[PDB]
Design a protein around this ligand. Structure first.
Ligand SMILES: N[C@@H](CCC(=O)N[C@@H](CS)C(=O)NCC(=O)O)C(=O)O
Ligand SMILES: N[C@@H](CCC(=O)N[C@@H](CS)C(=O)NCC(=O)O)C(=O)O
Lengths: 213, 215
């Protein structure tokens, strides 16, 4: 069985959604970020990223981690590529060419988009604008590239929803506060709505909503 | 024949090394960073990341890009995973579990090591307060070094007790940190692992070509 370590209000959401798309039963262990807990090492602290039990399985001290048949993996987007390769189905690459493409879009998201995106979710006056207008403009390159790629496509790879769309959608979810950025990239706007209208996404976010902020 | 776009004095070194490890024939197309070039769009300009001809290959305008039978891939570390998977041999994952592990280490390097590593090399290539800004980045890397150090206590390589694409990927990210001698001093197993990776003939041959390019 699959075990997923991490609260839904974290990058673990990427793995909960993927598991849902694949139809996998899983066990959720709601490990909390150590900064959202007042004194992480107290006996009555919630299970968190600085707990020795958790550090024994992910020495990096970050969520998510998943454990599948003894194998522990600790990188959210890569976790998803592994689940797709393992379990197959339409979300998985169908040939070596798609594997390259899916891998390429996933790493592009991780290195060129996520770092700026996540700062916006941290940010979320003239001072609040400048810090956001900086991270917003950074993303113009990324948005433009995806926008052009989606001119004649509904999905990034193989004319169907894949793990590449799922990985990307979750990174781009961090940017949704930037209304203006989406308005000038309508193909990305349409694509992200298309990804988020899926039942397994809805059902992930409903579980997520049950955790206090 | 594989085409690799990018000068060796770039992240394309990662793909040149990998191709060499795999014994793949490739065509090297030098593409420089547009900021190193006086007039990137002028007709006499060397091919660069802002050249329309190149932008038609990789719309992101970054190097490396590899082209394999029409398929264009544009993320150095992931390019190597693709090459390993396609061509096989001992650098490639032998099964789904190793694929998981090799993928995890690669994404860890990309998201958790490289950003700080890059800022070392960018400041170090290009002051009393300057030595303090670097120490901030150096401290952010302690975590990552410690984790790899622990993992290497009783391993010579990160996965499957042999040199794989995960080692090659990590080695190239960690090369960016080599100026930070105190960090390596305090993590002798990482230092020994890096030297072991760099002792390999394909790495030496990649660095020999690299050294021909001006700077
Ligand atoms: N690259 C990792 C990043 C993991 C990560 O940064 N996780 C955060 C939560 S979203 C965390 O656990 N932070 C620990 C803390 O700040 O206390 C991944 O994508 O899984
Ligand atoms: N994340 C990509 C992109 C790497 C990247 O940004 N490369 C640099 C040179 S190593 C570049 O293209 N610079 C061109 C410029 O922006 O001037 C990868 O790892 O392949």
């Amino acid at each position: 069985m699959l075990t997923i370590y991490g609260v839904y209000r974290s990058r673990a959401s990427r793995n909960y959604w993927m598991a849902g798309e694949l139809g996998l039963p899983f066990r959720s262990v709601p490990v909390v970020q150590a900064h959202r807990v007042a004194d992480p090492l107290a006996a009555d602290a919630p299970l968190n990223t600085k707990s020795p039990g958790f550090l024994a399985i992910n020495p990096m001290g970050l969520i998510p981690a998943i454990e599948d048949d003894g194998l522990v993996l600790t990188e959210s987007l890569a976790n998803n590529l592994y689940l797709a390769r393992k379990h197959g189905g339409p979300l998985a690459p169908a040939d070596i060419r798609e594997e390259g493409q899916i891998g390429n879009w996933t790493m592009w998201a991780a290195t060129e988009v996520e770092p700026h995106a996540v700062k916006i979710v941290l940010a979320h006056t003239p001072e609040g604008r400048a810090e956001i207008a900086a991270c917003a403009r950074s993303l113009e390159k990324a948005f433009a590239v995806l926008e052009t790629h989606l001119a004649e496509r509904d999905y990034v790879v193989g004319d169907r929803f894949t793990v590449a769309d799922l990985n990307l959608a979750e990174v781009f979810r961090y940017t949704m506060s930037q209304t203006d950025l989406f308005k000038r990239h309508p193909q990305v706007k349409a694509w992200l709505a298309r990804c988020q209208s899926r039942p397994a996404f809805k059902a992930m976010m409903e579980e997520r909503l049950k955790e206090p902020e």
